[PDB]
Amino acid sequence: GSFVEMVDNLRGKSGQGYYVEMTVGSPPQTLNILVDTGSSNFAVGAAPHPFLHRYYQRQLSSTYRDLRKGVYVPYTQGAWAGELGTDLVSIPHGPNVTVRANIAAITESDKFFINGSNWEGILGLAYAEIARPDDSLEPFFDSLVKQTHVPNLFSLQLCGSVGGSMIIGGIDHSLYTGSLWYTPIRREWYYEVIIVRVEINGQDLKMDCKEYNYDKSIVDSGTTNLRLPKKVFEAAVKSIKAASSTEKFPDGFWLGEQLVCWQAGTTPWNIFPVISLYLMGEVTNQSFRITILPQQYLRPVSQDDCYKFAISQSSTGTVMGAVIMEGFYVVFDRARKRIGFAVSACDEFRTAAVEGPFVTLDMEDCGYN
Numbered sequence: 417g418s419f420v421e422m423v424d425n426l427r428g429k430s431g432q433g434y435y436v437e438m439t440v441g442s443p444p445q446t447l448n449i450l451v452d453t454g455s456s457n458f459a460v461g462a463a464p465h466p467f468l469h470r471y472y473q474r475q476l477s478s479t480y481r482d483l484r485k486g487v488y489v490p491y492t493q494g495a496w497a498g499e500l501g502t503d504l505v506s507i508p509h510g511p512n513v514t515v516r517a518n519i520a521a522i523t524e525s526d527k528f529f530i531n532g533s534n535w536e537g538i539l540g541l542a543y544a545e546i547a548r549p550d551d552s553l554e555p556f557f558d559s560l561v562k563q564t565h566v567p568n569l570f571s572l573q574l575c576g577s578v579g580g581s582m583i584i585g586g587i588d589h590s591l592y593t594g595s596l597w598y599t600p601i602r603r604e605w606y607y608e609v610i611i612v613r614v615e616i617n618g619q620d621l622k623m624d625c626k627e628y629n630y631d632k633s634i635v636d637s638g639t640t641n642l643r644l645p646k647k648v649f650e651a652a653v654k655s656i657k658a659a660s661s662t663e664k665f666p667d668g669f670w671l672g673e674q675l676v677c678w679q680a681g682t683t684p685w686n687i688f689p690v691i692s693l694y695l696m697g698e699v700t701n702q703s704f705r706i707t708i709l710p711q712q713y714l715r716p717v718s719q720d721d722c723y724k725f726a727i728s729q730s731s732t733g734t735v736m737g738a739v740i741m742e743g744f745y746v747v748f749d750r751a752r753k754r755i756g757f758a759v760s761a762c763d764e765f766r767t768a769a770v771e772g773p774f775v776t777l778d779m780e781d782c783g784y785n
């Protein structure tokens with residue numbers, strides 16, 4: 417294929433995110449950057465930190481332009497503070513272009529960088545509406561499309577030391593099998609989508625579909641888990657427990673407070689159910705479903721394989737994190753305001769699936785207002 421040089425451009429450590437090499441400034445300064453569809457800022461570590469192997473040195477870059485404005489980005493689990501500026505940016509294993517982009521130089525942080533993750537910055541690929549300090553700070557992808565002829569689309573193949581591909585400007589047919597099924601991007605802020613039905617081993621969870629998207633459902637490459645709103649998490653855990661009753665697990669396992677380990681190569685994948693998420697399709701009353709295996713929602717943490725239940729509670733809507741994305745080739749079709757899912761080219765009894773079409777009525781009632 418024509419996008420061959422972008423294949424395998426992602427690396428990472430299990431549960432520590434996927435990173436791409438990005439070259440900043442003049443002379444070049446290459447750093448490993450977290451690929452995050454759940455945020456909108458391009459920000460790099462710019463001062464020594466115990467968890468950083470390297471950092472951006474603005475004084476060494478002749479093309480760096482200080483924007484003379486600070487920036488602060490807080491989250492529930494951590495935060496960072498820095499200085500705004502612009503500099504020349506290229507992705508050596510990405511598109512063959514160089515752009516002048518906004519860059520936040522991280523000078524201080526709290527619980528943001530991960531010890532041993534091998535990444536030193538973050539590439540927020542979501543929209544300007546959630547950019548900090550505000551929506552006037554143009555995200556990297558917007559700068560890329562405005563300054564070059566690169567098509568307004570990117571796609572991600574995250575393979576569960578990890579690897580993957582970020583194809584910028586198109587779709588690589590070698591990265592998937594079967595058909596690509598599209599769900600609309602409801603609103604351009606996060607990559608917001610609509611889940612219309614949930615099944616555990618083919619059994620309908622039978623909740624009002626508004627609950628699946630309360631207060632939003634997002635596609636986020638930067639979040640490890642499948643995060644579910646409290647009511648949905650509780651019903652989904654109750655159903656998963658019942659479907660996996662051939663073995664008993666402590667309550668704390670389902671809450672992520674306890675891990676369960678098995679002798680190398682003996683994990684009884686067959687005892688755990690498959691999870692199906694139905695997404696709103698592109699045609700009236702049409703939906704499709706994506707099916708997740710336990711190999712995706714049970715994440716590996718000697719002669720023992722330890723696992724964490726990677727489905728967790730949220731009070732800020734559903735988050736379809738790397739747990740969900742890892743079974744699929746995911747297309748962020750920004751030009752047509754849609755997200756595509758296909759079976760990824762990366763057991764003997766079951767496989768992750770993308771199936772359709774299904775008839776689902778009143779799907780418009782599933783969205784939060």
Ligand SMILES: C[C@H]1C[C@]2(CCN1Cc1ccccc1)C(NC1CCCCC1)=NC(=O)N2c1cccc(F)c1
Nearest residue numbers: 433452454455491492493494495527528638639732735
């Ligand atoms: C950007 C952050 C935002 C993120 C999820 C992960 N990415 C990526 C990431 C960053 C650092 C380390 C690991 C992942 C988040 N996302 C929410 C989704 C729902 C709607 C509200 C936002 N909440 C958090 O607390 N996060 C977080 C997690 C760890 C460290 C950190 F500093 C922040």
